[PDB]
A paper describes a structure:
The Notch pathway relies on cell–cell contacts, where membrane-spanning Jagged and Delta-like ligands (DLLs) on signal-sending cells bind to Notch receptors on signal-receiving cells. This induces two sequential receptor cleavages, releasing the Notch intracellular domain (NICD), which translocates to the nucleus and forms a transcriptionally active complex with the Mastermind-like transcriptional coactivator and CSL (C promoter–binding factor 1, Suppressor of Hairless, Lag-1), also known as RBPJ (recombination signal–binding protein for immunoglobulin kappa J region). The ICDs of all four Notch receptor paralogs are composed of a CSL/RBPJ-associated molecule (RAM) domain, ankyrin repeats flanked by two nuclear localization sequences, a transactivation domain, and a C-terminal domain rich in proline, glutamic acid, serine, and threonine residues.
To corroborate our predictive model, we crystallized mouse CSL (amino acid residues 53–474) in complex with the human N3RAM peptide (residues 1665–1682). These structural data also suggested that binding between N3RAM and CSL would be disrupted by phosphorylation at S1672. The binding site for S1672 resides in a small and hydrophobic cavity on CSL, suggesting that both the size and the negative charge on the phosphate group are likely to impair the binding of S1672 to CSL. All these regions are conserved in N3ICD, except for the His–Gly motif, where the glycine residue is replaced by the PIM-targeted serine residue. To confirm this, we performed isothermal titration calorimetry (ITC) on mouse CSL with human RAM peptides, using either N3RAM, phosphorylated N3RAMpS1672, or N1RAM (residues 1754–1781), which was used as a positive binding control. In line with this observation, we were unable to produce crystal structures of the phosphorylated human N3RAMpS1672 peptide in complex with CSL (data not shown).
Author numbering:
A (entry chain D): 1668 to 1682
B (entry chain C): 52 to 388, 394 to 473
Write the structure that this text describes.
DNA sequence: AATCTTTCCCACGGT
DNA sequence: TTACCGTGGGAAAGA
């Protein structure tokens, strides 16, 4: 683990 | 008579105050050419930023010197460098950036590569100069055959920056770029993010902290998309080749410039990175009729991939306003090595001198990419030392004969023994 | 000839 | 409404 970030999750959809 | 050379006092004032003016050009690394009278716009549109505290300091100086806010306003124009092709105005009124949405390169230009040219000046006609972007590759149109790793410029390496865009039914008005605003990923029609695309090993876990691999991105590899500005990342994704409006699960060839891509959200029930107006979602794909090797994807789930670049230039009027443009701005990439220091970079000229702190060094110009200089004795910084007693760090700055200061993020340290 | 790259052509669905 | 316009698929031309 060397790269750092802030996780962002998208909302799920299916029609 | 020649203009005033920078004094040791003026340099000390600068080293303490440091109000630098920076010019940034964020653009794509490739561009498709336009034939006849058509216009095939550069996507993402090139963006120019006026960074640093120097712009406010220059504005206030001009106003105190008797300029209106209209005269103190910086003006910009962008176009294809070294061409008979027309320049277009950028609107910088009330913002520190502007995108060039309608740029294109005609087949009349027979060059295989070009640079963008940003012409700048203040509202009172004081010339700033001409800033070039990095080199952009001309394309007739993308190849329909698999990409070989021999053409490194048409491939994408792990740890490089890309832009991603989606277009609905060939309409220019529908173009939306993956972008991060207010801590959220969205699909902007006006702004675009430059995202690091990191290759991950298949066994790498989800987390804000992750290990990266080196190499060229291929379809079917696990990747991480991180905003180069905000550090915002999407979950681990699998980059997949788009054929018509399906994602191919079996394609493993190298990802090529301007190819259509699908981003399967790893370990989900067929969820693909997708847009819905300005909103970024994940949308479930439909299984293909009689085929397991492909999945039918949503309209907002195909993304064109394109490598992006950045040109950056920093300058300061060390002895106040000058007649000559501040351009071409020298850029220092590295430092090497009677003790000599070699500078490697761009836009070096014979009228530059290397300064170590407030101490001006004997400079030898070789070419626009190389410069050598005589390291001052430690006496220049510590009056009676004879040798390096304790480590002494000094900034390395390039200075023009008319007093223009070009800072580097590079220091030189006098090492003991 | 056969095949991939470059240039030319056109209409969908937008302003 | 008509007119005009990027864009992408595809045809034709070139290497």
């Amino acid at each position: 683990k060397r790269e750092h970030s802030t996780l962002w999750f998208p909302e799920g959809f299916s029609l | 008579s020649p203009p005033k050379r920078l004094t040791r006092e003026a340099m000390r004032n600068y080293l303490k105050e440091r109000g630098d003016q920076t010019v940034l050009i964020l653009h794509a690394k490739v561009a498709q050419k336009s034939y006849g009278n058509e216009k095939r716009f550069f996507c993402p549109p090139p963006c120019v930023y006026l960074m640093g505290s120097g712009w406010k300091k220059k504005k206030e100086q001009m106003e105190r010197d008797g300029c209106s806010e209209q005269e103190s306003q910086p003006c910009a124009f962008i176009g294809i460098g070294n061409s008979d092709q027309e320049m277009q105005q950028l609107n910088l009124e009330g913002k520190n950036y502007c995108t060039a949405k309608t740029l294109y390169i005609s087949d009349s230009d027979k060059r295989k590569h070009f640079m963008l040219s940003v012409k700048m000046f203040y509202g009172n006609s004081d010339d700033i100069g001409v800033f070039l972007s990095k080199r952009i590759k001309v394309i007739s149109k993308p190849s329909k055959k698999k990409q070989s790793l021999k053409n490194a410029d048409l491939c994408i390496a792990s740890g490089t920056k890309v832009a991603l865009f989606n277009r609905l039914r060939s309409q220019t008005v529908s173009t939306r770029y993956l972008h991060v605003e207010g801590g959220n990923f969205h699909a902007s029609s006006q702004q675009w993010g430059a995202f690091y695309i990191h290759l991950l090993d298949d066994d790498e876990s989800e987390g804000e902290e992750f290990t990266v691999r080196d190499g060229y991105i291929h379809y079917g590899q696990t990747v991480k998309l991180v905003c180069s500005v905000t550090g915002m990342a999407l979950p681990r994704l699998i980059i997949r080749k788009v054929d018509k409006q399906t994602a191919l699960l079996d394609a493993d060839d190298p990802v090529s410039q301007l190819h259509k891509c699908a981003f399967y959200l790893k370990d989900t029930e067929r969820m693909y990175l997708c847009l819905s107006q300005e909103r970024i979602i994940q949308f479930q794909a439909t299984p293909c009729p009689k085929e397991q090797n492909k999945e039918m994807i949503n309209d907002g789930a195909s993304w064109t991939i394109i490598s992006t670049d950045k040109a950056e230039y920093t300058f300061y009027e060390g002895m106040g306003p000058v007649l000559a443009p501040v351009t071409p701005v020298p850029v220092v990439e590295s430092l090497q090595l009677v003790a000599m220091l070699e500078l490697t970079g761009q836009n070096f000229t014979p009228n530059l001198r290397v300064w170590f702190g407030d101490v001006e060094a004997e400079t030898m110009y070789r070419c626009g990419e190389s410069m050598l200089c005589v390291v001052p004795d430690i006496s220049a910084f510590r009056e009676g030392w004879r040798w390096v007693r304790q480590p002494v760090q000094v900034p390395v700055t390039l200075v023009r004969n008319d007093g223009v200061i070009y800072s580097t993020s590079l220091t030189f340290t006098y090492t003991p023994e």
